[PDB]
Amino acid sequence: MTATNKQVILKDYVSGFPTESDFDFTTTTVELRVPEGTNSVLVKNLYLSCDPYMRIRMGKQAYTPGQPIQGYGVSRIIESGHPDYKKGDLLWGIVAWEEYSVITPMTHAHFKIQHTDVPLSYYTGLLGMPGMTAYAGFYEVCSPKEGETVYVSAASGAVGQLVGQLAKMMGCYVVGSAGSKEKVDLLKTKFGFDDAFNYKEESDLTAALKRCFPNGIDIYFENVGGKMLDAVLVNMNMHGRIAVCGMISQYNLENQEGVHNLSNIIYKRNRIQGFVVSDFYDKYSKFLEFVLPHIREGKITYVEDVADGLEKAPEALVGLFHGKNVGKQVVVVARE
Amino acid sequence: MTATNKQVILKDYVSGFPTESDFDFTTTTVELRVPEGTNSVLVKNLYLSCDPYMRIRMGKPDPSTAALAQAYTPGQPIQGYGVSRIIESGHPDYKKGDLLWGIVAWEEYSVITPMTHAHFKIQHTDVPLSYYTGLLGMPGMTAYAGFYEVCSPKEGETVYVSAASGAVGQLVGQLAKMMGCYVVGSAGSKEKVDLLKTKFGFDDAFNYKEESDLTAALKRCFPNGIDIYFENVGGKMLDAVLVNMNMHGRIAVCGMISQYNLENQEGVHNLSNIIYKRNRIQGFVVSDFYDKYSKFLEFVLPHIREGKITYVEDVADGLEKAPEALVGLFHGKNVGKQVVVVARE
Ligand SMILES: NC(=O)c1ccc[n+]([C@@H]2O[C@H](COP(=O)([O-])OP(=O)(O)OC[C@H]3O[C@@H](n4cnc5c(N)ncnc54)[C@H](OP(=O)(O)O)[C@@H]3O)[C@@H](O)[C@H]2O)c1
Ligand SMILES: NC(=O)c1ccc[n+]([C@@H]2O[C@H](COP(=O)([O-])OP(=O)(O)OC[C@H]3O[C@@H](n4cnc5c(N)ncnc54)[C@H](OP(=O)(O)O)[C@@H]3O)[C@@H](O)[C@H]2O)c1
């Protein structure tokens, strides 16, 4: 290996939706040496994650045009130059969209994989940054108690599916919405939710919510926004929490959708708390040692829509925003 | 034993703003005697209060609003907060010379059954009895409970409060100042902003109505963004604040009178920002904390009596005015706590 290196780049700033045309392919050639830098390691990017924050990251902390779009991925140390990383092991964290990248590890972008008795695809979704985010947001920011109704929202996907699974381990009554009957079956089937509805087979969303929850929503895990939020507010419960994890139904408009119903948080006494996963990474290694018994035991599960190659990685990032993605969108770039 | 007790009533459920018309008057004759059943007391309503909550209790009954809540049964009188003197026995902790505050009807001679976070006995007289409908009562309990146990302020923090010339936003700004915060306020009247700037304390304030790009103004007052936000307003305000906010910014949602007399509630766009800069919106209801009311007095009653807490009012006589009075809040014709004297003392 003193190879060529393929990279998926960004042309220029996406207005509205992202499309395959706002991404271009290019070949650099990499020397597999130590290499040149300071606390650097060279790596072979194994897997990539299709992260929805990326849209916000590609409009005019924003990736520079002409340079590969950066994003989370799990990788293997080719050559080292960093104390912690032996010249042959597994990492995850921010990396370029390439086969061969050079990143100098830092404690909260880059973690080090010390459990391989589980897929190295999980560490871009379940045992990776969506997992910390489902752990963090549902445990701290929602502050769940037992027996109480949890509405989850892009539930099939990356963050959504551990929340209803964590919540059902508590023993709540969980419901979840998803866009198609493939995903809405996955929910009650695979992760045994207590109900699940296809929000795209509905006009009556407030009434949809009001039907799925007889006695109202104590907790709502927010992964989407707008219309959905507004029905959830009518539906919310007294002293019930809403942890705002994100708003996919907003990242893409060049005109942000307007919410009405906030007036309800007075009467119903709603905490609405918008977190960020980063802040909880000191609790990462506690999450890991908590879930890792449940996965390899058949208690926590996952579902990941796995593309193959950087070639099929624009057709993949774009797929999140409409909903091609069935579960976590990962991108296999090196099979091992 | 009859005594002719006048009243004020609601014709019908309101849609939009109240007007003097949605209320009718009428009279009756209460027989002045010892009330029975539960632990009941016949009272004599000296004062009464115009608080903007009464509009969500005037509208047609939604479950959403039924959590505050359940509208006034159209035809019998209006229920509200007022000061009252015990005209008869009925109960243990209430002697017939006595004087409570709480929820009475809009009538001359109410009868009440005094519940623990309903009816509160006045003990202290050295202060105007009209203070038990502002500062020493419920709207006073809001600014205390909403800013200490809800905005979780830290000394030095930037603060913005709105509807800053009314029973809550003028005592908030002072509890704010009492810990070196940078309270700025807002109000619509050209002179109302002058009570904020001078009389109440605020470091700056503005006239939102003389102000056109709302957010430009909050960008001026706080060049270093807004840590806390007390809100008695909503809509177009909350979107300027959410832009201007700081990280780990907090918001206490007391009320949103703007939205209240809208049939067609305004759209709050900018709510997405809170995912970036870990903002917390929290809606509370003062009613929940009336345990920390003994404690609140204990606090305020020293600070007022010493020049640390200033409080303007707006008085007006009898029920005849209490329509025009209650309808004046929504248009901002109350230059402080709007009180109505049924019968002075
Ligand atoms: N809190 C944090 O710090 C944190 C961390 C990471 C990511 N996030 C954010 O939250 C999301 C990521 O994970 P994920 O669990 O949502 O799954 P994902 O599968 O990774 O992302 C795509 C999903 O978006 C949904 N979707 C797209 N447009 C939608 C719309 N207009 N309305 C409703 N649903 C829509 C689709 O579900 P349907 O087919 O069912 O409609 C699809 O499954 C992103 O918005 C991301 O920016 C937050
Ligand atoms: N438990 C709770 O959550 C709780 C408890 C008590 C009260 N509240 C609520 O919060 C408010 C407190 O009452 P208060 O006695 O302190 O007096 P207040 O809010 O000052 O009421 C009158 C004021 O409303 C302002 N106003 C009128 N229309 C407005 C509009 N469209 N936009 C912005 N401001 C407008 C006027 O001034 P400017 O034009 O000068 O701005 C006027 O000074 C009420 O809405 C009440 O229902 C909530």
UniProtKB/Swiss-Prot annotation, chain B:
Indicate the segments annotated as coiled coil, or none if absent: none
Q: In which tissues is it expressed?
A: Expressed in leaves.
**Keyword terms of this UniProt record:** Cytoplasm, NADP, Nucleus, Oxidoreductase
Subcellular location, principal: cytoplasm
Q: Can you tell me which residues bind NADP(+)?
A: 52-53, 163-169, 188, 192, 208, 232, 254, 260, 284-286, 330, 334-336
A GO molecular function assigned to this protein is: 2-alkenal reductase (NADPH) activity
Residues noted as binding substrate in the record, renumbered to the chain: 53, 260
Gene3D superfamilies for this protein: Medium-chain alcohol dehydrogenases, catalytic domain, NAD(P)-binding Rossmann-like Domain
Tell me any Pfam family this protein matches. Answer: ADH_N_2
Q: How does activity depend on pH?
A: Optimum pH is 8.0 for 9,10-phenanthrenequinone-reduction. Optimum pH is 6.5-7.0 for azodicarboxylic acid bis[dimethylamide]-reduction. Optimum pH is 6.0 with (2E)-hexenal or 4-hydroxy-(2E)-nonenal as substrate.
Q: Which GO terms describe its biological process?
A: response to oxidative stress
Can you tell me which family this protein belongs to?
Belongs to the NADP-dependent oxidoreductase L4BD family.
Q: What does this protein do?
A: Involved in the detoxification of reactive carbonyls. Acts on lipid peroxide-derived reactive aldehydes. Specific to a double bond activated by an adjacent carbonyl group. Can use both quinones and diamide as substrates, but not menadione, ferricyanide or phylloquinone. Can use 4-hydroxy-(2E)-nonenal (HNE), 4-hydroxy-(2E)-hexenal (HHE), (2E)-nonenal, (2E)-hexenal, (2E)-pentenal, propenal (acrolein), 3-buten-2-one and 3-penten-2-one, but not (R)-(-)-carvone, n-nonanal, n-hexanal, (3Z)-hexanal, cyclohex-2-en-1-one or 12-oxo phytodienoic acid (OPDA) as electron acceptors.
Task: Name the chain's protein.
Answer: NADPH-dependent oxidoreductase 2-alkenal reductase
| Provenance organism | Arabidopsis thaliana (Mouse-ear cress)
Organism ancestry: Eukaryota, Viridiplantae, Streptophyta, Embryophyta, Tracheophyta
Q: Gene encoding it? A: AER
